[PDB]
Amino acid sequence: GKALVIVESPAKAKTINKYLGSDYVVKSSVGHIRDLPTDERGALVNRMGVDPWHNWEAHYEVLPGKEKVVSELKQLAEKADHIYLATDLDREGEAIAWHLREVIGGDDARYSRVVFNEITKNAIRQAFNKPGELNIDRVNAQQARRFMDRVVGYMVSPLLWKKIARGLSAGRVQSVAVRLVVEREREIKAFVPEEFWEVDASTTTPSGEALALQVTHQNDKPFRPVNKEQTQAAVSLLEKARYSVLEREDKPTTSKPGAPFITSTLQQAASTRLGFGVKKTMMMAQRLYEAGYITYMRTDSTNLSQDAVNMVRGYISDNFGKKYLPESPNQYAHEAIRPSDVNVMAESLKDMEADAQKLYQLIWRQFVACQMTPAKYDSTTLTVGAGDFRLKARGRILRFDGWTKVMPALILPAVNKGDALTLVELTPAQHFTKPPARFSEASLVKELEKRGIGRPSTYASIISTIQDRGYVRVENRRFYAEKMGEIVTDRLEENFRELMNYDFTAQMENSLDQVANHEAEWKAVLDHFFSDFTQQLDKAEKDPEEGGMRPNQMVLTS
Numbered sequence: 001g002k003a004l005v006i007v008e009s010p011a012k013a014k015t016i017n018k019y020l021g022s023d024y025v026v027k028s029s030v031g032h033i034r035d036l037p038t039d040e041r042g043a044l045v046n047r048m049g050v051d052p053w054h055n056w057e058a059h060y061e062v063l064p065g066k067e068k069v070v071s072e073l074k075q076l077a078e079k080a081d082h083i084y085l086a087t088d089l090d091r092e093g094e095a096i097a098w099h100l101r102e103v104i105g106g107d108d109a110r111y112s113r114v115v116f117n118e119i120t121k122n123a124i125r126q127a128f129n130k131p132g133e134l135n136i137d138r139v140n141a142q143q144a145r146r147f148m149d150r151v152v153g154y155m156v157s158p159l160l161w162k163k164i165a166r167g168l169s170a171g172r173v174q175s176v177a178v179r180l181v182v183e184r185e186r187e188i189k190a191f192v193p194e195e196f197w198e199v200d201a202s203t204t205t206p207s208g209e210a211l212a213l214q215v216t217h218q219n220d221k222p223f224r225p226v227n228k229e230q231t232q233a234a235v236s237l238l239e240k241a242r243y244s245v246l247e248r249e250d251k252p253t254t255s256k257p258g259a260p261f262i263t264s265t266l267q268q269a270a271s272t273r274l275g276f277g278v279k280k281t282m283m284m285a286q287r288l289y290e291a292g293y294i295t296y297m298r299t300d301s302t303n304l305s306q307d308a309v310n311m312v313r314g315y316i317s318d319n320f321g322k323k324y325l326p327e328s329p330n331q332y333a334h335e336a337i338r339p340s341d342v343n344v345m346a347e348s349l350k351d352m353e354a355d356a357q358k359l360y361q362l363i364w365r366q367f368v369a370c371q372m373t374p375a376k377y378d379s380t381t382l383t384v385g386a387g388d389f390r391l392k393a394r395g396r397i398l399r400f401d402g403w404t405k406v407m408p409a410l411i412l413p414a415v416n417k418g419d420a421l422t423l424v425e426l427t428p429a430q431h432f433t434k435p436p437a438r439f440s441e442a443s444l445v446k447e448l449e450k451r452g453i454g455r456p457s458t459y460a461s462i463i464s465t466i467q468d469r470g471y472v473r474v475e476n477r478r479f480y481a482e483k484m485g486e487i488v489t490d491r492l493e494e495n496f497r498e499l500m501n502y503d504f505t506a507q508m509e510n511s512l513d514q515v516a517n518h519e520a521e522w523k524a525v526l527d528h529f530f531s532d533f534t535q536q537l538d539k540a541e542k543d544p545e546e547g548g549m550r551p552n553q554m555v556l557t558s
């Protein structure tokens with residue numbers, strides 16, 4: 001009679017229940033149901049639940065207490081015509097859907113795998129309207145990832161305990177992420193500030209208005225003294241010069257709004273704008289999503305659907321006006337993270353705490369803004385001559401706010417070419433170059449994406465998973481490398497070159513995408529991975545005098 005619909009959480013079940021008819025019975029598996037534990041050695045194989053020596057055979061086990069949950073599903077399955085798997089659209093979502101279908105058993109024809117990137121009336125309709133099949137390639141991709149991660153962790157770690165210290169850990173990508181922080185740490189420790197000066201000038205227009213200028217050239221060459229004397233020398237020359245407006249240029253400029261958020265950009269914005277960490281932002285994001293307020297929070301696509309863009313353009317038109325609505329929609333190049341209904345304001349959210357509302361507001365503003373016209377400004381650039389010196393002044397005036405209208409609310413004098421300015425005061429100032437900035441959780445993710453290391457679905461885990469391991473720590477919202485973090489990084493770099501290499505790591509991601517798109521077979525990809533890995537691991541175990549990993553020692557004076 002009725003149909004069975006399975007989701008992974010209660011909150012997701014309630015929201016989706018609002019859009020599924022009487023013939024549907026929604027049920028949340030409430031968790032993962034089944035998963036993995038916690039030249040071959042049976043001991044290692046059981047702890048991992050994967051066998052690199054018997055063609056990657058796995059040993060999945062239902063989770064604790066989840067046994068009664070299993071039987072409850074089987075019952076609902078026998079009294080339902082069709083079974084719908086409505087797990088989240090990403091790969092682990094596909095895998096979770098796979099585990100459900102394995103555990104419940106039955107004919108494959110009995111199953112369907114729905115896909116949706118937001119939980120709305122219209123989205124849930126098209127989802128169950130044209131349902132698809134479980135994509136085994138996306139499943140194979142997800143498991144391959146879990147398998148190699150497991151292999152690196154359970155096989156490299158034992159070596160680290162023997163060579164460095166008990167309790168240490170290793171991570172396929174985790175170690176690579178730690179390397180970036182370790183290199184940044186070392187950069188900062190070795191940086192040597194450099195002295196360089198600047199000179200500003202206070203002048204008067206003929207009328208008598210105040211005009212501030214900064215020295216840019218001397219002898220037509222850039223002006224950049226490096227000590228106190230070089231400056232005073234230039235200062236006393238400038239004190240006698242006759243100042244005049246050698247040139248004026250007025251050009252209209254514009255500023256365009258940013259593209260709609262994606263996982264990485266969202267985290268950075270949340271961290272920069274609201275001081276939210278990656279974990280905080282991703283938990284609220286998911287909470288808003290499962291509540292039906294925003295689209296799926298794991299994406300690297302900045303695209304927007306036709307309806308989404310048409311609903312927003314209408315909003316801009318009713319609430320802002322003709323001059324804010326571009327002629328044609330803005331096209332940036334799955335969907336971006338955006339509100340599900342542009343007409344629902346942050347203040348109208350129900351089950352959400354203050355910060356989850358602030359995040360929604362941020363997402364809302366970005367979305368609305370990206371579809372509005374750009375801001376217009378009238379820039380002015382005055383160039384002033386004085387002896388062999390050339391000075392400059394910058395000024396900007398807003399003419400049309402455009403997109404900045406949806407963001408919170410927030411001047412050179414009049415002079416013609418050839419006018420004489422009167423010197424009033426000369427102000428020298430000493431500065432010094434700064435060392436590279438420290439990574440933030442979000443910035444680190446940003447760096448990872450730039451290098452193609454993470455994936456919208458692993459960033460948060462990567463970030464969290466490299467902490468409380470004694471390698472890197474967050475202090476004042478910034479990353480700091482610990483000594484043990486450098487100790488382990490050099491070891492891995494010397495004895496696991498390929499695994500620590502940035503290009504090889506990014507390549508693995510491409511590698512994994514290829515399995516998902518049927519451009520590669522998962523076991524073959526795992527075999528090649530294991531081959532390179534065990535060759536590295538074998539040499540690492542040898543005594544250092546044969547090229548093996550160095551011990552964390554320090555011999556006497558003997």
Ligand SMILES: Cc1cn([C@H]2C[C@H](O)[C@@H](COP(=O)(O)O)O2)c(=O)[nH]c1=O
Nearest residue numbers: 090091092093138455456457458516517
């Ligand atoms: C669930 C999950 C998905 N993903 C991804 C990467 C892909 O961009 C995305 C879906 O891609 P696909 O449509 O090509 O299969 O799922 C991860 O990287 N890690 C995860 O844990």
